[PDB]
Scaffold this active site. Sequence first.
Site, PDB file in Angstrom:
ATOM      1  N   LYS A 107     -15.167  16.726 -25.961  1.00 50.33           N
ATOM      2  CA  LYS A 107     -14.997  15.474 -25.176  1.00 50.33           C
ATOM      3  C   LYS A 107     -16.147  14.448 -25.224  1.00 50.33           C
ATOM      4  O   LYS A 107     -16.215  13.230 -25.019  1.00 50.33           O
ATOM      5  CB  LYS A 107     -14.658  16.032 -23.695  1.00 50.33           C
ATOM      6  CG  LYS A 107     -13.439  16.552 -23.437  1.00 50.33           C
ATOM      7  CD  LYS A 107     -12.960  17.012 -22.060  1.00 50.33           C
ATOM      8  CE  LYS A 107     -11.445  17.748 -22.089  1.00 50.33           C
ATOM      9  NZ  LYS A 107     -11.394  18.165 -20.852  1.00 50.33           N
ATOM     10  N   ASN A 144      -4.340  20.299 -29.651  1.00 54.67           N
ATOM     11  CA  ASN A 144      -5.134  19.482 -29.695  1.00 54.67           C
ATOM     12  C   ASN A 144      -6.102  19.182 -30.871  1.00 54.67           C
ATOM     13  O   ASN A 144      -6.537  19.924 -31.316  1.00 54.67           O
ATOM     14  CB  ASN A 144      -5.812  19.068 -28.518  1.00 54.67           C
ATOM     15  CG  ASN A 144      -5.007  19.042 -27.192  1.00 54.67           C
ATOM     16  OD1 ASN A 144      -3.838  18.920 -27.007  1.00 54.67           O
ATOM     17  ND2 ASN A 144      -5.629  19.401 -26.043  1.00 54.67           N
ATOM     18  N   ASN A 154      -2.839  13.995 -32.875  1.00 51.02           N
ATOM     19  CA  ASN A 154      -3.978  12.978 -33.637  1.00 51.02           C
ATOM     20  C   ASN A 154      -3.967  11.588 -32.773  1.00 51.02           C
ATOM     21  O   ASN A 154      -4.194  10.519 -33.303  1.00 51.02           O
ATOM     22  CB  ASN A 154      -3.733  12.668 -34.928  1.00 51.02           C
ATOM     23  CG  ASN A 154      -4.853  12.499 -35.786  1.00 51.02           C
ATOM     24  OD1 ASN A 154      -5.013  13.164 -36.836  1.00 51.02           O
ATOM     25  ND2 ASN A 154      -5.807  11.805 -35.332  1.00 51.02           N
ATOM     26  N   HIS A 156       1.623  12.947 -23.837  1.00 53.43           N
ATOM     27  CA  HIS A 156       1.683  14.167 -25.172  1.00 53.43           C
ATOM     28  C   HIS A 156       3.184  14.821 -24.999  1.00 53.43           C
ATOM     29  O   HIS A 156       3.261  15.324 -26.204  1.00 53.43           O
ATOM     30  CB  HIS A 156       0.485  14.727 -25.737  1.00 53.43           C
ATOM     31  CG  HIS A 156      -0.199  15.456 -24.403  1.00 53.43           C
ATOM     32  ND1 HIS A 156       0.517  15.861 -23.329  1.00 53.43           N
ATOM     33  CD2 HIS A 156      -1.540  15.716 -24.101  1.00 53.43           C
ATOM     34  CE1 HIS A 156      -0.198  16.406 -22.325  1.00 53.43           C
ATOM     35  NE2 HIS A 156      -1.315  16.391 -22.968  1.00 53.43           N
TER      36      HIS A 156
HETATM   37  O1  LIG Z   1      -0.326  10.939 -25.719  1.00 45.84           O
HETATM   38  C1  LIG Z   1      -1.300  11.734 -26.315  1.00 45.84           C
HETATM   39  C2  LIG Z   1      -2.353  12.258 -25.656  1.00 45.84           C
HETATM   40  C3  LIG Z   1      -3.291  12.864 -26.226  1.00 45.84           C
HETATM   41  N1  LIG Z   1      -3.261  13.097 -27.769  1.00 45.84           N
HETATM   42  C4  LIG Z   1      -4.354  14.084 -28.241  1.00 45.84           C
HETATM   43  C5  LIG Z   1      -5.771  13.430 -28.436  1.00 45.84           C
HETATM   44  C6  LIG Z   1      -6.573  14.238 -27.273  1.00 45.84           C
HETATM   45  O2  LIG Z   1      -7.890  14.523 -28.178  1.00 45.84           O
HETATM   46  C7  LIG Z   1      -5.799  15.221 -26.807  1.00 45.84           C
HETATM   47  C8  LIG Z   1      -5.851  15.153 -25.339  1.00 45.84           C
HETATM   48  O3  LIG Z   1      -6.017  13.917 -24.786  1.00 45.84           O
HETATM   49  P1  LIG Z   1      -5.834  13.307 -23.239  1.00 45.84           P
HETATM   50  O4  LIG Z   1      -6.429  14.254 -22.380  1.00 45.84           O
HETATM   51  O5  LIG Z   1      -4.714  12.744 -23.370  1.00 45.84           O
HETATM   52  C9  LIG Z   1      -6.898  11.938 -23.411  1.00 45.84           C
HETATM   53  P2  LIG Z   1      -6.736  10.467 -23.945  1.00 45.84           P
HETATM   54  O6  LIG Z   1      -5.510  10.509 -24.718  1.00 45.84           O
HETATM   55  O7  LIG Z   1      -6.525   9.495 -22.713  1.00 45.84           O
HETATM   56  O8  LIG Z   1      -8.026   9.892 -24.542  1.00 45.84           O
HETATM   57  P3  LIG Z   1      -8.346   8.682 -25.283  1.00 45.84           P
HETATM   58  O9  LIG Z   1      -8.554   7.476 -24.352  1.00 45.84           O
HETATM   59  O10 LIG Z   1      -7.406   8.183 -26.587  1.00 45.84           O
HETATM   60  O11 LIG Z   1      -9.621   9.180 -25.993  1.00 45.84           O
HETATM   61  O12 LIG Z   1      -4.647  15.062 -27.302  1.00 45.84           O
HETATM   62  C10 LIG Z   1      -1.925  12.385 -28.172  1.00 45.84           C
HETATM   63  O13 LIG Z   1      -1.705  12.766 -29.413  1.00 45.84           O
HETATM   64  N2  LIG Z   1      -1.003  11.975 -27.677  1.00 45.84           N
END
Ligand SMILES: O=c1ccn([C@H]2C[C@H](O)[C@@H](COP(=O)(O)CP(=O)(O)OP(=O)(O)O)O2)c(=O)[nH]1
Length: 483
Positions: free
Chosen positions: A375, A214, A77, A186
């Site tokens: 997305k 995710n 999240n 992540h």
């Molecule tokens: O570090 C993270 C990354 C993602 N997510 C979650 C949320 C996402 O739905 C998913 C993977 O996102 P990404 O491909 O990493 C994209 P981005 O995080 O750049 O996006 P925004 O700029 O924030 O909008 O995991 C996390 O909980 N932590």
Amino acid sequence: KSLSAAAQACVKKMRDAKVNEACIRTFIAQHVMVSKGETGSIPDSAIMPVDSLDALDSLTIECDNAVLQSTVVLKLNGGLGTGMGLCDAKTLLEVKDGKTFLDFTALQVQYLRQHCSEHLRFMLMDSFNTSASTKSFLKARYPWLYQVFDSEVELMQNQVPKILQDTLEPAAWAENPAYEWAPPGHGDIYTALYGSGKLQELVEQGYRYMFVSNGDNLGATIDKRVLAYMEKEKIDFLMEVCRRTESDKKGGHLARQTVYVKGKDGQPDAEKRVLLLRESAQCPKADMESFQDINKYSFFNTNNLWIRLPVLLETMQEHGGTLPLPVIRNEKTVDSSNSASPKVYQLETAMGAAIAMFESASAIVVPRSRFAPVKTCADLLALRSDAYVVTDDFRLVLDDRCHGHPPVVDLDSAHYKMMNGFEKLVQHGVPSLVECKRVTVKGLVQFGAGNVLTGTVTIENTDSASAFVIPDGAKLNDTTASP
Ligand SMILES: O=c1ccn([C@H]2C[C@H](O)[C@@H](COP(=O)(O)CP(=O)(O)OP(=O)(O)O)O2)c(=O)[nH]1
């Protein structure tokens, strides 16, 4: 000790911030790798392709409910979903019928607790941005989860300092002190689970399996056939993958690699296998052809991961409390908007990369119905539409009259990439995309309330003086409609 002053400054920096110790140990290890000039390249000469895997459709057998009582469901999240121009939590966007991503998850957990295993555990990975909104949502919508939210539900993501490309020191931006930090990908989840002690807690509480995915993916739900499969084949780490298509040539792929167990004794033939993950950034300029060849490397990570926790904990303790992972080196400035701000490095890891860090690991091919991220607002529209439907266990599946294929939606990103404009398109109502193979909207357009569309449907507005407003009850079949 005996660390370069640069690194020493980062430790000092993170110390004052009251940063968890597990994060500092991990990050410094990563900081050292970079300082030593680790390229992080993963050439084709170091890997071999993976060609055959078990499919999820082939498994029939479900696990007993006792298994699910030691299962943990964890959703990611952290994301803000800025891609649709939204400055709050992504999971909080309505998907279907006044229900958000967080709704469908909570309702799915509810189902499993009542009808299968009451001891099922639900957790969330929150960034600082998403913590408040997530808690506030649950306080109104789902009390029982809120009650414990602080105590065992919420797992906070760590922040790590951006380092200067020039001296590797912690970057200092006086204009915005908060811009000196960044989320570390992540893959931080492991570091987060250890330092928070919640790995140790769960395992002590008799929790063995954990499913991570995710938050924006409504394809990822618990499937008891996967759990049974793991118990049978003694798998500690299972990565769900879908098939790599023409569209996915940019995305990374599953690959295999070789190390050897100590000693050459036994039959001097049989090799080893390790499964790793290769992002495009890791691939060299010369190998970019094969990389995008999906007949060689045919699978990509859906980021739906099942992990055997006690094994996971054991593994981190062998490596001194952290989990080594390949580190992507993000080249940015300290303030992304400022082109003239100090150039910095941002060290990030992917959670899928851990697959190569387990003795018993594998990858299973799942249908692409299990990989359904939103997305864009175009993807968001499909779900609002009657093309999809909500089940009694609160899954989101494609209506049977679609016959397995979801309506492709092309929206004009000038007007509709932003959720703001997009809502204005659906303002007066929502159309029926169930019979629509492809729908396309160019320029500025607003929908009639109760319309329906079949086959190819194109809507073009070149004028762009006000907006082309579709009549109520209008029906479009295999046509383009301008004003
Ligand atoms: O570090 C993270 C990354 C993602 N997510 C979650 C949320 C996402 O739905 C998913 C993977 O996102 P990404 O491909 O990493 C994209 P981005 O995080 O750049 O996006 P925004 O700029 O924030 O909008 O995991 C996390 O909980 N932590």
